[PDB]
Design a protein around this ligand. Structure first.
Ligand SMILES: C[C@H](C(=O)N1CCC[C@H](C(N)=O)C1)c1cn(C)nc1C(F)(F)F
Ligand SMILES: [Zn+2]
Length: 140
């Protein structure tokens, strides 16, 4: 579990969104596994606006932050899970690292701010849903 809190927005994995998230929906995209809802209080996270391919992510199944090199956001085939059938997920970045079901939502960050959140795993690989192209998170 985990979310990004930027301005008056909460960014979570679409597959982990709560009823309150759906009742205060701003935007959702199943192909990216992302959902954004509105919040009453202002958040402290800042979104990175860069093309970094190195950063650090939080892994809840190890209570540890790991430095990683990750690929550029792309269209990647993801195996069937309890939340989606086997399909192509867009805006996904892969890295070598530990992940388990329960780790989705952990933040990946670079020197510029938040890059994205854990969204996929398996095989000693971890995938992150990028948020750096969502420029509207910084305003309104
Ligand atoms: C099976 C699951 C996963 O990749 N997804 C489940 C939830 C839906 C995901 C998607 N974005 O489509 C696919 C996974 C396997 N390992 C070892 N770690 C994970 C994870 F970190 F919890 F994501
Ligand atoms: Zn950066």
């Amino acid at each position: 579990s985990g979310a990004i809190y930027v301005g008056n927005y909460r960014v979570v994995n679409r597959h982990l969104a709560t009823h309150n998230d759906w009742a205060n929906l701003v935007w959702e995209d199943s192909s990216r596994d992302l959902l954004v809802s509105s919040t009453t209080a202002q958040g402290c996270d800042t979104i990175a606006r860069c093309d970094c391919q190195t950063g650090v992510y939080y892994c809840s199944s190890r209570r540890k932050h790991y430095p990683v090199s990750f690929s550029k956001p792309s269209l990647i085939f993801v195996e069937a899970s309890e939340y989606y059938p086997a399909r192509y997920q867009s805006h996904l970045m892969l890295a070598v690292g530990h992940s388990e079901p329960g780790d989705c939502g952990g933040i990946l960050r670079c020197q510029h701010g938040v890059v994205g959140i854990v969204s996929t795993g398996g095989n000693g690989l971890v995938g992150f849903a990028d948020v750096r192209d969502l420029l509207w998170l910084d305003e309104e």
